[PDB]
């Protein structure tokens, strides 16, 4: 029941050890003893709580220690325990799988043709946002794409849901990494716990980055708000955003059109 | 895959023949079959490989015992242990003996004699030579072993100066200057070898591999390249590779290309790196293809056949890859149908029409599922790689023979096939064709269809919409644009590419039960949320006072706690 008695008017040279000694091993074996000391001064405030397991043990302690001389005083052992309209809410926690993790930014692309490569799968999912990795298993007919942003991954699940990649309607949803999948597979063949770990945060406030933004390749930028200052490099490292993003982008897409028409990239 | 279980099975099957004490022709052939299945699966390191050669030699199968030795030489370059055994055997042989015994000896001498631990190999050949009475032949091996930086070089020098009582110093000056120059190099090489001899220790670590010192040893034998180098860096690569690492192969090939030996040596090294290296590396392989294209200009006929067998072997293992098919087809158009400008034009045009004829009969043959293995292109077509053959046929029919009617007939036929309706170079060639003719009707009908019924990768759809907007703005006037606007699709070629860019599934033109409502704040997690049926929050309070407000009707009050998830991940991939 964790029955608590509130001893008070204690002497200054009486310890929590002595308060345990006068509470535990007489009439009970009390679960805890805690004198309130001063939070910066250390000198005991003269009152402290003790926590007995059983309520009969505490009341037996209460009737017998009332007035009992402890290190020079009578230690006043009254029981500690046993209408606003508005209170703040309180809620449970959804136990952190891959769906209920608010930082999970890796899409599970399922139902692939198995005739689709990794570069051809990078070509679909790239303009939604910058992309850390696109590895796919050998013949499980399903892939894995991971973005830097949660916003870009949500845009990819919205925009590319049910789109056919090489004539098979694709199945997009959430799903963990390769390390976490190996961990869950071995701890599911041992079926012990299969608990997951939260994906790492960006340690915000972060000021340079405007999420869901791509730049493909000397900088004196005026660092003003409307522009973009920092960015993630495409695979990986962080680049200061140059002035000439559109020239490099448009020039690379004219390159991509003229080389893809003749056959040097199927992506 | 289980090389340990493949090691364990041969260790178990051999222990079944050995402990049942019989010849055991089942288990003898099973241990041989387990040896063949392993050696095809694994490179078979020489220490493990020797037991297989020892058991077959114990089973007295002389012709087969020679053949497994050749495989061992390919598997391990530093296999002096297999080299000496193959030299120790085949001396107990038939009439071809005297020629074969030196042939294996000299082949090892071009394989292993530049190693620091090669002192046993020359001595064994010397032992073979001293058993003969060709003291001239013994003398020739003595001078060659003197000139190479070997372990017991001083031990070899003094020994050869006492056994050769008849002809010791016929040329004193020549022998000792070659010996001391060998000692200058071996003193130099002693720095790297002792730095290697003090790191190699099997503790399952980087020191057992000695990769830092092996990269140190290979580097310092690269720069001071006194022409033993190409044999030495081969010997340096051989001890360093044996300790799969493709970057070491690339550095050895880069050095040997810079050293400019004849190219067939490089082709041998390239074939070996093709053979023993694991699949999916995909970087030395395309290097080999572009080396075969570059060196094609020097010698014509054999490089076409090396190229052809290479591209066939690489569509064995990467069938989903498409750059090989167009690369094969570029080489076929260059080599088999070649015709310069200086030739009379009817010859030129007939070679173009022959190429169109073979290419069209190839794709028409493969669609109707009849194959013709005499023509190599028929074998090479894969359904991932069919589209690039159709593209080559289109681009050759339209740009070379120059008839637009036949070209439009091929487009209108092949865009209905299953294999190539979703292919990128077919449709992007179609875009360049209907851009060449400047008509906009087919282009507007194409990009109006680009998300719904012609499925392309989003990077290609973005490129097509951007370039078509840039093209339309500069090649079309308002009188064409305002007559191009039709209202049932709300299509307008100025603004519709600007809206259709990142979302492919874009339709241009009971809400509470759609799958955009139900998972509104949180994607993927679907919850039917409670709501009031007749809410008044759109109604102003200036109009609520006119008549009294009804009670609220509710919907979905049972489901404030129910939240449900379609977990594709666990079902289709964790639990298969």
From Swiss-Prot, chain A:
Superkingdom field: Eukaryota
GO biological process: mRNA 5'-splice site recognition; mRNA splice site recognition; mRNA splicing, via spliceosome; positive regulation of mRNA splicing, via spliceosome
GO cellular component: commitment complex; cytoplasm; cytosol; nucleus; spliceosomal complex; U1 snRNP; U2-type prespliceosome
Swiss-Prot/TrEMBL domain comment: The RNA binding domains RRM2 and RRM3 are required for NAM8 meiotic function. Within the U1 snRNP complex, the RRM2 domain of NAM8 is positioned to bind to the intronic region immediately down-stream of nucleotide +13.
Protein function: Component of the U1 small nuclear ribonucleoprotein complex (U1 snRNP) involved in the initiation of meiotic recombination. Involved in the formation of DSBs at recombination hot-spots through meiosis-specific splicing of REC107 pre-mRNA. Collaborates with MER1 to promote splicing of essential meiotic mRNAs REC10, AMA1, MER3, HFM1, SPO22 and PCH2. NAM8 interacts with the pre-mRNA downstream of the 5' splice site, in a region of non-conserved sequence and is required for efficient splicing of uncapped RNA precursor.
Additional detail: Present with 1480 molecules/cell in log phase SD medium.
Name listed for the protein in its UniProt record: Protein NAM8
Encoding gene per record: NAM8
Span of the entire protein shown here: 161 to 523 of 523
Swiss-Prot record, chain B:
Cystine pairings recorded for this chain: none
A Pfam family annotated for this UniProt entry: HAT_PRP39_N
Keywords associated with the record: mRNA processing, mRNA splicing, Nucleus, Repeat
Location in or out of the cell: Nucleus
Predominant place of localization: nucleus
InterPro entries with a match to the protein in the record: HAT, TPR-like_helical_dom_sf
Annotated GO biological process: mRNA 5'-splice site recognition; mRNA splicing, via spliceosome
Record's function text: Function prior to stable branch point recognition by the U1 snRNP particle to facilitate or stabilize the U1 snRNP/5'-splice site interaction. Has a direct role in the assembly or function of a catalytically active spliceosome.
Additional comment: Present with 4460 molecules/cell in log phase SD medium.
Name of the featured protein: Pre-mRNA-processing factor 39
